[PDB]
Amino acid sequence: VTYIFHQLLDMREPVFEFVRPPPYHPKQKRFPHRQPLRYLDRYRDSHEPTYGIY
Amino acid sequence: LTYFSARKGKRKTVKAVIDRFLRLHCGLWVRRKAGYKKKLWKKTPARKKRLREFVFCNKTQSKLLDKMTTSFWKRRNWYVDDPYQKYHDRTNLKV
Amino acid sequence: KNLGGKSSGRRQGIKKMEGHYVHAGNIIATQRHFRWHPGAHVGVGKNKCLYALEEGIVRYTKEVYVPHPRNTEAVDLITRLPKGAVLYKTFVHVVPAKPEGTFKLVAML
Amino acid sequence: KNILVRMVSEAGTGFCFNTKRNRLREKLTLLHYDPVVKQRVLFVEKKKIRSL
Amino acid sequence: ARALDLLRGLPRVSLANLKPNPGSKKPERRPRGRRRGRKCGRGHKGERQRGTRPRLGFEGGQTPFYIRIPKYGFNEGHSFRRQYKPLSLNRLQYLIDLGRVDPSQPIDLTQLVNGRGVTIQPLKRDYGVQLVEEGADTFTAKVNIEVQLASELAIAAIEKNGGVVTTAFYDPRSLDIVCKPVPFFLRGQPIPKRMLPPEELVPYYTDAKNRGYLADPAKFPEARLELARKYGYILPDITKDELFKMLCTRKDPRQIFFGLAPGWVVNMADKKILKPTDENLLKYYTS
Amino acid sequence: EFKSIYSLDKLYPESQGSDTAWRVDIPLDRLTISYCRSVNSKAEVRFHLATAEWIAEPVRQKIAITHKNKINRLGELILTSESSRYQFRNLADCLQKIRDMITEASQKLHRIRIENMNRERLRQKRI
RNA sequence: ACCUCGGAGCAGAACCCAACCUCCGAGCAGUACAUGCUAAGACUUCACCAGUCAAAGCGAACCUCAAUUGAUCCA
Ligand SMILES: [Mg+2]
Ligand SMILES: [Mg+2]
Ligand SMILES: [Mg+2]
């Protein structure tokens, strides 16, 4: 099918991927009472040390 | 607590509070669960997994712990290889 | 001479009535004996509590009860019935809302 | 009637876990799971902790 | 402004015209009258009206929240942990662009304090600055920094652009003299010698991978070459350009300031430096 | 200047020259390095696999076969990284992917196994 | 006579509901030794503390009972 798209149709082949919907998390609270400490990681998006104004 | 000491006239921290809790700079107090090292032979592993967790505190528990410590304990701390350092700033709240 | 009996209410019953949107893992209803049975996309805990296995809408139906053949209590309750007699129970279903993912274009190689 | 004993792993050692067993029956040997070896390994009971 | 032109037509501002900005002064509430005081806000007679409510944390007799909970060492050795103020490369590019830190000189910790780029306080046990990889892309500066800790990616971002990083050590005493040097030269003491790291930190500052100031200058080209291979930049040789004599200068260990030596007494007043010539002092200061 | 006991001329006396601290496989002029701040960035190294002189010919065949799903229409091996906010760390991730491909090339499946075996059981049909 | 925990009635149908109110009980036993490790989402005894349920995952196979219990400090 690589041969079909490139050779005789003369176009780049399209490649698809089965994308699942993003996981539901509830609305983040100020005081996440009794949740574990992992709760703050459900709501972050970078796994790298941010340093702020410094 | 002591609101005005007799030597300095300053507030004092309650040292029980420091000995048990962890203040994150955003205002969240982290604690350990009560009984996490008691009678483990009669607890189901789900429950033991629940007790070995670092659990956040309530709003009023948080304000009670703020009033019982002083501004030294509320301060930015740039430690070297701090385990809790990624949990100080609060990411991505929409209030 | 009547000591005891000071236990409080268990706060059981239905948490998600019919029509309610439900995310995966929400407890639908906690019971003490099987008042409601798990139907489609509904799981059961050790405490006979019905939770949800998909995101969707809770529906309650009435279905034919046919127990597992290794369940000698209910199976012995079957064989005592007359020839037309069919047991029903009320079941809880979660009708799943979303598709479980889409195909999306990634790259024009 | 029962005893809470500790079970010491024979390999991947330093790993214990506690069990119940009767006062009267023999000293337990089990096949528990070591997460240090990450295998199932024989454990042998070494000390009774508390007679529950 | 139309507003001074308003001030023409108005009577003169005096001590009889002045008035606080409305909103500044909330009015004092005091317990007199029908509303502010009959019970005066204490309620009915109990223990909270009498004035004797128990201490903060007392839950009336059940074991309090802040005591039902196991002691765990979150804060166990808090005042002996070392702290390092972050200085991002975004921040340092920002200081170089606005003239506050001159990159044609060595950037010691005094130059980051005098440009007011970084505020470090030696009490509260900051042991100095750590470089931080934030802003590594879009960091375009040839610089010579002496920073007490540095991540690999920050060393890579400096050494890409033709820079030099080294990681020095400072005692609390030494760091305190480094940050604010002028209130030390009014103290009258001779310049001390900075101490070597403790045993926890000697394996840090003797490694060439993190550019230790006690490491070999014979293992550095291997480490510079390794980062240049890892992060995909061709390693420029610092030897060619004209700033090389500037980009080579380090102060040795046991030297706090740059051009000075331990044991000297800076006389700020008549602008002299008194140097000792006794042999015992020279054995002690050049140790 | 000032030199104490712990100067680097005394701790390491074998390396005493000033030039000793500064005297010095994939070539980067060959690769095409492109960026897109798609939150992470996204580095993208592409290079034409056929013309790559700095990879051996059998290793170019093993790469041309195993990683054929990365190869462009124009014969360019294209490989990206969006694992970091810093484009140094994404570029390093891409180059490490390349070095991993050359080292591995020099020296769910189950369902497809069964569906192929049954497809060969229906292939049992001759003229 | 009692003091804690659970079941039933009161309290008929979501939840909750007292009494020196009416009746039963509990303070274990048995089996297993992956009764491993992790983790979305929830319930919750009207607070807190405690309690419960749990998909996916890694690793493996191919728990019953209602209650069946005890914080912190200290050892
Ligand atoms: Mg009752
Ligand atoms: Mg009650
Ligand atoms: Mg509640």
Curated annotation (Swiss-Prot), chain B:
GO terms for cellular component: mitochondrial inner membrane; mitochondrial large ribosomal subunit; mitochondrial ribosome; mitochondrion. Its main location: mitochondrion. It is found in: Mitochondrion. One of its GO terms (molecular function) is structural constituent of ribosome. The keyword Coiled coil does not apply. GO terms for biological process: mitochondrial translation; translation. Coiled coil: none annotated. Keywords: Mitochondrion, Ribonucleoprotein, Ribosomal protein, Transit peptide. The keyword tRNA-binding does not apply. Belongs to the bacterial ribosomal protein bL35 family. Component of the mitochondrial large ribosomal subunit (mt-LSU). Mature mammalian 55S mitochondrial ribosomes consist of a small (28S) and a large (39S) subunit. The 28S small subunit contains a 12S ribosomal RNA (12S mt-rRNA) and 30 different proteins. The 39S large subunit contains a 16S rRNA (16S mt-rRNA), a copy of mitochondrial valine transfer RNA (mt-tRNA(Val)), which plays an integral structural role, and 52 different proteins. This is Large ribosomal subunit protein bL35m. The gene is MRPL35.
From Swiss-Prot, chain D:
The keyword Transit peptide applies. It is found in: Mitochondrion. One of its GO terms (molecular function) is structural constituent of ribosome. Component of the mitochondrial large ribosomal subunit (mt-LSU). Mature mammalian 55S mitochondrial ribosomes consist of a small (28S) and a large (39S) subunit. The 28S small subunit contains a 12S ribosomal RNA (12S mt-rRNA) and 30 different proteins. The 39S large subunit contains a 16S rRNA (16S mt-rRNA), a copy of mitochondrial valine transfer RNA (mt-tRNA(Val)), which plays an integral structural role, and 52 different proteins. This is Large ribosomal subunit protein bL33m. The lineage of its organism: Eukaryota, Metazoa, Chordata, Craniata, Vertebrata. Its main location: mitochondrion. The keyword Signal does not apply. It comes from Homo sapiens. Belongs to the bacterial ribosomal protein bL33 family. GO terms for biological process: mitochondrial translation. Signal peptide: none annotated. The gene is MRPL33.
From Swiss-Prot, chain E:
One of its GO terms (molecular function) is structural constituent of ribosome. Residues 27-43 have a biased composition (Basic residues). One of its GO terms (biological process) is mitochondrial translation. Its main location: mitochondrion. The keyword Mitochondrion applies. Gene3D superfamilies: 3.100.10.10. Component of the mitochondrial large ribosomal subunit (mt-LSU). Mature mammalian 55S mitochondrial ribosomes consist of a small (28S) and a large (39S) subunit. The 28S small subunit contains a 12S ribosomal RNA (12S mt-rRNA) and 30 different proteins. The 39S large subunit contains a 16S rRNA (16S mt-rRNA), a copy of mitochondrial valine transfer RNA (mt-tRNA(Val)), which plays an integral structural role, and 52 different proteins. This is Large ribosomal subunit protein uL15m. It comes from Homo sapiens.
Swiss-Prot record, chain F:
Keywords: Hydrolase, Methylation, Mitochondrion, Protein biosynthesis, Ribonucleoprotein, Ribosomal protein, Transit peptide. GO terms for cellular component: mitochondrial inner membrane; mitochondrial large ribosomal subunit; mitochondrial matrix; mitochondrion; nucleoplasm; plasma membrane. The keyword Transit peptide applies. The chain holds residues 38 to 193 of 206 of the full protein. The lineage of its organism: Eukaryota, Metazoa, Chordata, Craniata, Vertebrata. This is Large ribosomal subunit protein mL62. The gene is MRPL58. Its main location: mitochondrion. Belongs to the prokaryotic/mitochondrial release factor family. Mitochondrion-specific ribosomal protein mL62 subfamily. Its EC number is 3.1.1.29. It comes from the Eukaryota. One of its GO terms (biological process) is mitochondrial translation. Methylation of glutamine in the GGQ triplet by HEMK1. Component of the mitochondrial large ribosomal subunit (mt-LSU). Mature mammalian 55S mitochondrial ribosomes consist of a small (28S) and a large (39S) subunit. The 28S small subunit contains a 12S ribosomal RNA (12S mt-rRNA) and 30 different proteins. The 39S large subunit contains a 16S rRNA (16S mt-rRNA), a copy of mitochondrial valine transfer RNA (mt-tRNA(Val)), which plays an integral structural role, and 52 different proteins. The keyword tRNA processing does not apply. Down-regulated during the in vitro differentiation of HT29-D4 colon carcinoma cells. It is found in: Mitochondrion.
